[PDB]
Amino acid sequence: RTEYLQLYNTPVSVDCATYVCNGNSRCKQLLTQYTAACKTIESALQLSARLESVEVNSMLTISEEALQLATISSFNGDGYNFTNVLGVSVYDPARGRVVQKRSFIEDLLFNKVVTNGLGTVDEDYKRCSNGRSVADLVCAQYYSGVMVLPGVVDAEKLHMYSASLIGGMVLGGFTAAAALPFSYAVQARLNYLALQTD
Amino acid sequence: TLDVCTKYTIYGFKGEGIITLTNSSFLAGVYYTSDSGQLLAFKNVTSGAVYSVTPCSFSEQAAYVDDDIVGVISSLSSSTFNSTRELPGFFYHSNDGSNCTEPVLVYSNIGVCKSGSIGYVPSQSGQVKIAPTVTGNISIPTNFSMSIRTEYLQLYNTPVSVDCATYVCNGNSRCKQLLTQYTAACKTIESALQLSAR
Amino acid sequence: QKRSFIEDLLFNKVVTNGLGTVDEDYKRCSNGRSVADLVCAQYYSGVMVL
Amino acid sequence: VLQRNQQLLAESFNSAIGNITSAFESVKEASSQTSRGLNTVAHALTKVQEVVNSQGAALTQLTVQLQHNFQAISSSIDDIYSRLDILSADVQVDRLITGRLSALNAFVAQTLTKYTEVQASRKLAQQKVNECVKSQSQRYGFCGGDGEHIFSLVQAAPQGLLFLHTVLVPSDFVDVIAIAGLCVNDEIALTLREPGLVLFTHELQNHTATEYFVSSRRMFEPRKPTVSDFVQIESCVVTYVNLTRDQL
Amino acid sequence: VVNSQGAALTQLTVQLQHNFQAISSSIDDIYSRLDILSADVQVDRLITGRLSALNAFVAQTLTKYTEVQASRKLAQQKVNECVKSQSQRYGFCGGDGEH
Amino acid sequence: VDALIEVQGTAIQRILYCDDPVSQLKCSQVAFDLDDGFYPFSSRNLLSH
Amino acid sequence: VDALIEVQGTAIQRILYCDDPVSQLKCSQVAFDLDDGFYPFSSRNLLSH
Amino acid sequence: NFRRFFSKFNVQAPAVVVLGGYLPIGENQGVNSTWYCAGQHPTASGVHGIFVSHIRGGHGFEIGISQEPFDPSGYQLYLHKATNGNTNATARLRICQFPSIKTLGPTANNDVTIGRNCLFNKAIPAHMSEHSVVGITWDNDRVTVFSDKIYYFYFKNDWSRVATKCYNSGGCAMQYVYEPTYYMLNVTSAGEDGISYQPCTANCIGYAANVFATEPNGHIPEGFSFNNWFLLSNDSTLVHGKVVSNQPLLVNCLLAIPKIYGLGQFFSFNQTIDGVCNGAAVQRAPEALRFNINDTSVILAEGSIVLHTALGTNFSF
């Protein structure tokens, strides 16, 4: 069976002063009479952002043993594939260090639902101030004052978290010479639910 | 005048900004506008060259600690602080280019120290639980201790009541006689209020 | 029975004395001869805090 | 039952309650990123501190819109009624009352909207107090988190309750070999019955130490096995040791 | 849901172009063409309308934050109980069958 | 000039000017003391007229 | 006449008239292709003047 | 001695100011009675101000405050710093609720009303010298720190007893003052060299609460009661609260104790006023005029003022 759930939402910030006035002095002098609404909205915005960021960063739990065992070589499949699920190891980018990339199914689903160049990827705001180009929509609300905060969690963090989570079952004893076969775990679960003689 | 901040009056619209030349080709229209009412792009009809305008002002964020402005984050390479460090997507400005090992203000994977240095927050490592096994090697836990956790929950809220008749009229007779035409809203609001309270 | 240590600490930490948490005596609003506070303002307006 | 565990646990509990009570005061003096994590004192205090002002708010602004004038000469109905003819004054006060009633309609809509989530949260809270406190839950990490639940304390808090769950946490691990089962005469499989118990051998026969003990999968209590804890199977596997009647 | 979460931002720019019973939506245009008095009144109307609109927007924001809070609580519960261990409740994990 | 005024019993005390970005932020939140955190600021454009 | 126009770089392409109930539904959703489903329609009343 | 103490706070050269407070007078100048509280005409109200000049042990300096009424709801003051070095003399200063002991010394319980943590927690530099002393003074809501540059803190609390952790101190090393004194200060040197500190004779209270010090940037100096000042309001007044608005506060020049307007003094809204400024001066066109009225009868009897409009209309009062 399949199931899908959400945990976080994209936060946004804005400055009321620049949004309501485009740098004029007399207008902001007039605005100074009524400002408590601006304080209320911004207090709510940054407070809500900070609390959820703190709690979501506290939510994650990471194990290095699962990182070691998440590779294809470290996994001993026995009658089971676990290929489209397990990630692809030994990747050497310009950084020069081995990194983990997307596996089959998830890389399919990102390119299916998410079009390249959409708002899911982080947006470089330097080009907005660079100039000499026809401004896109993002620069429009950048000038307006709407700031789209960077994602609290990176997609790579989610992928490595998933790799760590899926490796918990194969985690046997500490400093295991070889990973325990999945069939043994299946037998263990079958025996746990009820005794068997076959 | 080009490439300077200036008060411009183009085609009946007056604004403030820096005007620049763009290498775009378009054979339709004389000016181009966005959904914000800003005439960013206009064409030199005699030559066909296109120009784009950007405001002389910007909105940026700052990190305030103790009693002074320490962190400045922006998209411009010029700042009061001596050190300007380019980071993926933006510019950071500070007076120290040293390491940041004990950040005070942390968000997502980015942390800023009191001294002004910036850095990447290391990923938090969570607890470990041993997966079920039926053979081989088991790490049986022992030598336990206490960990007291906190939790807070709400169960009730303060109720409030109001009389619409006295709120909308301060005891006048003709006003309430006029109000008698439309009263079902008052009945609805009070029926909701006392029922929910009870 | 009165408050113990931890809870008596937390009430006086988060709740300032004379705030809206404590029950409000509405008799003083009708008593008069004093500069009316904010509570009497919405009492006259019609807002009743149960 | 040698009572050193009891005193160690008690002194650890006293030290822990002492330092958590200390952490209630001036938490920011030496607070770390871990100290402000989930299910921590700092998170609870900041949550309650913000929510108390949040619930105490949203009433002051209700008075504000009364002063607002809705395309009328003045916001005082008595002022308007005694200075201008009845017709336009009636029209203007109709505009005033319509705007005011719409504003309070929005207000009352917000009210039961607030009532909904407190209904749901109070349902969850009564469930949790019914299940995590008066009895023992068998779900790992449900009470408190990432650990077995022993007991909890309940304290009154402004506009709610506070839970103080005591979680037992391990600190050391014992690594021993395990044995799957036994076959005598390689037809009678003597196998343990309850999965929660496990049979192990402390070390090996390297120095004649083939002693067998049985214990739970979380507690290290090496004890002699009992006949009633095992069952007989007609089928045997390679992994089972092929013992004899003399060594039984 | 991905388009639902990606939406509800574009319309925020729209009401800026809307004119609130004023000569024009550009405050700079109005300020330099008419006397300070009626221009100040009109810009007061503009700022009041704009602040009310963003008040509605921010009210919608934490309103959205509430249900994602609740759903994330449920999700962390489910990942704690249906994955790392074995649940004894029939149909709880997945449905109508043992997990 | 523009400044933050706090009144207690019709008594003038605790004056605070706003001719400074730090002062501008301080009197943008009508608080003498501000907690540590992140706040928005607008680029200066009054130098040249 | 009334029709749906799609512009890409100030180029006129993919014209589509609306003198048909199917065409009216098509240009009521500014989409060249419409997914299968249920949609509302208004009875014709322009035949008789 | 007194020169260093007066030079701790900066004052413009063309300025004369009268200071009133519990200034140091003598090493052992103390009360002749045992009263420590305050009432009608209070003089022996305990140590109103304490000053430290010397040590016998040298381990360090510590100060703390308390009160006989013993109200645990308010704050408490505790400071500690190390002597034998100017750099090491960084005083750690704390206006916090310290649990301490209900009595003197570790013999009793602590304060059970301390829910919140603290308000003031700072490190302030200090210097050690024979003629340089470090002091604290409390008076009603105001509390002032005589160390380096001046401090003004606003909080309503009560204190009547002073405690020092370092008991190894002589009688003359510590100096406690309990009676306010008035002194006229005149420093025509733009520096630490003060001309004189002659005590004031008459109109001392009025002079203290009316004379300013024109800062070079034009800002008003801190430490003023503003008794003769009110907010500029067209209608109504805020009973209590906070607000930001444009107000007439920036000053170009100040004239006090005047004599020349009895000769028909003329002011123009265009040209800068002429007179002996109270310190620094700024060459700017005036925007508004503020008048601090001492006696109404002087204006009523022979005071004659005429308002000259831009049109030329004359308005005689």
Ligand SMILES: *[C@@H]1O[C@H](CO)[C@@H](O[C@@H]2O[C@H](CO)[C@@H](O[C@@H]3O[C@H](CO[C@H]4O[C@H](CO)[C@@H](O)[C@H](O)[C@@H]4O)[C@@H](O)[C@H](O[C@H]4O[C@H](CO)[C@@H](O)[C@H](O)[C@@H]4O)[C@@H]3O)[C@H](O)[C@H]2NC(C)=O)[C@H](O)[C@H]1NC(C)=O
């Ligand atoms: C960077 O931008 C700033 C402002 O925008 C400019 O101004 C200062 O430049 C100095 C030069 O590096 C920096 O501050 C100095 O740091 C020195 C070393 O720092 C260590 O030691 C101090 C304690 O002394 C610690 O607080 C700190 O965390 C480090 O551990 C200090 O030795 C300096 O103190 C000296 O200051 C003056 C001038 O040199 C001397 O006369 C004193 O006697 C004293 O010895 C000083 O604190 C820092 O960059 C800026 N300071 C501040 C407060 O912002 C710089 O010009 C600009 N460029 C560079 C390269 O800094």
Ligand SMILES: *[C@@H]1O[C@H](CO)[C@@H](O[C@@H]2O[C@H](CO)[C@@H](O[C@@H]3O[C@H](CO[C@H]4O[C@H](CO)[C@@H](O)[C@H](O)[C@@H]4O)[C@@H](O)[C@H](O[C@H]4O[C@H](CO)[C@@H](O)[C@H](O)[C@@H]4O)[C@@H]3O)[C@H](O)[C@H]2NC(C)=O)[C@H](O)[C@H]1NC(C)=O
């Ligand atoms: C969790 O449990 C599983 C299930 O048993 C273990 O898997 C086997 O574990 C046993 C015991 O832990 C292993 O036996 C051990 O082999 C290790 C290999 O190191 C030496 O191996 C040869 C043997 O002579 C040497 O030549 C070589 O140089 C290595 O130094 C050693 O720890 C032991 O072998 C001998 O090591 C030294 C050096 O010779 C001697 O002095 C010792 O006395 C000892 O005789 C030991 O015998 C077995 O190899 C494991 N097999 C497999 C397939 O995993 C896991 O290892 C265990 N997890 C742990 C321990 O982290």
Ligand SMILES: *[C@@H]1O[C@H](CO)[C@@H](O[C@@H]2O[C@H](CO)[C@@H](O[C@@H]3O[C@H](CO[C@H]4O[C@H](CO)[C@@H](O)[C@H](O)[C@@H]4O)[C@@H](O)[C@H](O[C@H]4O[C@H](CO)[C@@H](O)[C@H](O)[C@@H]4O)[C@@H]3O)[C@H](O)[C@H]2NC(C)=O)[C@H](O)[C@H]1NC(C)=O
């Ligand atoms: C659960 O917790 C218990 C209690 O701490 C642990 O038992 C301890 O285990 C550690 C390591 O295994 C021991 O540390 C060292 O043990 C050596 C041998 O232990 C014997 O002797 C000690 C007395 O020294 C007895 O307490 C113990 O029961 C054994 O009989 C010692 O020789 C070592 O001595 C070193 O430290 C001492 C100071 O303690 C110095 O004076 C010595 O000179 C030398 O430097 C050392 O103590 C520890 O002793 C054990 N304590 C007890 C009370 O048994 C369990 O191991 C742990 N369970 C786990 C980890 O799975």
Ligand SMILES: *[C@@H]1O[C@H](CO)[C@@H](O[C@@H]2O[C@H](CO)[C@@H](O[C@@H]3O[C@H](CO[C@H]4O[C@H](CO)[C@@H](O)[C@H](O)[C@@H]4O)[C@@H](O)[C@H](O[C@H]4O[C@H](CO)[C@@H](O)[C@H](O)[C@@H]4O)[C@@H]3O)[C@H](O)[C@H]2NC(C)=O)[C@H](O)[C@H]1NC(C)=O
């Ligand atoms: C206690 O004692 C019992 C009894 O010996 C052990 O159980 C195993 O019993 C079997 C049967 O007597 C022993 O023989 C092994 O049989 C395995 C399966 O049977 C196959 O036999 C033939 C030949 O392989 C197949 O054609 C046929 O289809 C059956 O499927 C085989 O897998 C073993 O073959 C191994 O050796 C041959 C060479 O003889 C190689 O060619 C193979 O590739 C393979 O390596 C073997 O024939 C078996 O030896 C017994 N196990 C052990 C470990 O000895 C219990 O295991 C034992 N308990 C303990 C703890 O030692």
Ligand SMILES: *[C@@H]1O[C@H](CO)[C@@H](O[C@@H]2O[C@H](CO)[C@@H](O[C@@H]3O[C@H](CO[C@H]4O[C@H](CO)[C@@H](O)[C@H](O)[C@@H]4O)[C@@H](O)[C@H](O[C@H]4O[C@H](CO)[C@@H](O)[C@H](O)[C@@H]4O)[C@@H]3O)[C@H](O)[C@H]2NC(C)=O)[C@H](O)[C@H]1NC(C)=O
């Ligand atoms: C109580 O009620 C009274 C009404 O009696 C209000 O008084 C008004 O206050 C405002 C605010 O100062 C006055 O407005 C001012 O008008 C000046 C005169 O305008 C001339 O100059 C401008 C160019 O600046 C021309 O465009 C115009 O046509 C006129 O020729 C303005 O100059 C003022 O703006 C500038 O003033 C100075 C001048 O350098 C600058 O330093 C400022 O920064 C600013 O840019 C200003 O707009 C108005 O005239 C007053 N009316 C009357 C009748 O006196 C009170 O404000 C009100 N509230 C209180 C608390 O008293």
Ligand SMILES: *[C@@H]1O[C@H](CO[C@@H]2O[C@@H](C)[C@@H](O)[C@@H](O)[C@@H]2O)[C@@H](O[C@@H]2O[C@H](CO)[C@@H](O[C@@H]3O[C@H](CO)[C@@H](O)[C@H](O)[C@@H]3O)[C@H](O)[C@H]2NC(C)=O)[C@H](O)[C@H]1NC(C)=O
């Ligand atoms: C410090 O106190 C002295 C004394 O002034 C006395 O008190 C004042 C309140 C007035 O009542 C004075 O009349 C009275 O004497 C003052 O400083 C000194 O003031 C004298 C003025 O008598 C200055 O002499 C002047 O010298 C110039 C140049 O020769 C002449 O043109 C003047 O006519 C006058 O004679 C003297 O220079 C001045 N010296 C110093 C060091 O201040 C002053 O009143 C007061 N300081 C300040 C800043 O007010």
Ligand SMILES: *[C@@H]1O[C@H](CO[C@@H]2O[C@@H](C)[C@@H](O)[C@@H](O)[C@@H]2O)[C@@H](O[C@@H]2O[C@H](CO)[C@@H](O[C@@H]3O[C@H](CO)[C@@H](O)[C@H](O)[C@@H]3O)[C@H](O)[C@H]2NC(C)=O)[C@H](O)[C@H]1NC(C)=O
């Ligand atoms: C100060 O007053 C003068 C004159 O204006 C007078 O006062 C006004 C309040 C009105 O009531 C007027 O009706 C009345 O006549 C003004 O200053 C004059 O203009 C400039 C300003 O600095 C100065 O001289 C000028 O220099 C330029 C450059 O060379 C010439 O082009 C001008 O023709 C003029 O000479 C000088 O201050 C003064 N000049 C003269 C001849 O009076 C000003 O309006 C006012 N406010 C200020 C100076 O801030």
Ligand SMILES: *[C@@H]1O[C@H](CO)[C@@H](O[C@@H]2O[C@H](CO)[C@@H](O[C@@H]3O[C@H](CO)[C@@H](O)[C@H](O)[C@@H]3O)[C@H](O)[C@H]2NC(C)=O)[C@H](O)[C@H]1NC(C)=O
């Ligand atoms: C329970 O926790 C407390 C600390 O929270 C442990 O120590 C107790 O501390 C208080 C305050 O320090 C002691 O109060 C005493 O009051 C007398 C006056 O009546 C005063 O003279 C003392 O100096 C002290 O302030 C209290 O007596 C003390 N409790 C003791 C010594 O038993 C306490 O030990 C913890 N109890 C257990 C069983 O662990």
Ligand SMILES: *[C@@H]1O[C@H](CO)[C@@H](O[C@@H]2O[C@H](CO)[C@@H](O[C@@H]3O[C@H](CO)[C@@H](O)[C@H](O)[C@@H]3O)[C@H](O)[C@H]2NC(C)=O)[C@H](O)[C@H]1NC(C)=O
């Ligand atoms: C009302 O106020 C105006 C000023 O706002 C007065 O105007 C000024 O009046 C004085 C004397 O009345 C004039 O002084 C004269 O100057 C000439 C030289 O020009 C001199 O010969 C005379 O002896 C005298 O000193 C001054 O010039 C004049 N200023 C202006 C701008 O007109 C007016 O007098 C006042 N009304 C009354 C009734 O006094």
Ligand SMILES: *[C@@H]1O[C@H](CO[C@@H]2O[C@@H](C)[C@@H](O)[C@@H](O)[C@@H]2O)[C@@H](O[C@@H]2O[C@H](CO)[C@@H](O)[C@H](O)[C@H]2NC(C)=O)[C@H](O)[C@H]1NC(C)=O
């Ligand atoms: C001290 O800093 C240098 C570089 O400065 C910064 O370092 C990090 C805090 C991060 O913010 C970088 O982007 C800054 O440039 C460190 O050198 C970097 O080290 C990281 C990993 O530690 C590596 O990914 C970068 O490629 C390195 N960059 C360069 C130019 O060498 C250095 O490691 C820091 N030292 C310590 C002890 O943390």
Ligand SMILES: *[C@@H]1O[C@H](CO)[C@@H](O)[C@H](O)[C@H]1NC(C)=O
């Ligand atoms: C436009 O031409 C190229 C890209 O087409 C670019 O490198 C160049 O700088 C541009 N020239 C301008 C903007 O004048």
Ligand SMILES: *[C@@H]1O[C@H](CO)[C@@H](O)[C@H](O)[C@H]1NC(C)=O
């Ligand atoms: C727990 O409290 C004791 C004192 O009772 C203290 O020594 C210890 O450091 C505290 N533990 C932690 C983790 O703070």
Ligand SMILES: *[C@@H]1O[C@H](CO)[C@@H](O)[C@H](O)[C@H]1NC(C)=O
């Ligand atoms: C400074 O020096 C003094 C010398 O008496 C010493 O007592 C004190 O501890 C020192 N402080 C620091 C911070 O080095």
Ligand SMILES: *[C@@H]1O[C@H](CO)[C@@H](O)[C@H](O)[C@H]1NC(C)=O
């Ligand atoms: C000021 O008034 C006095 C009244 O005593 C008078 O003698 C004097 O001449 C007046 N001054 C001027 C300049 O008119």
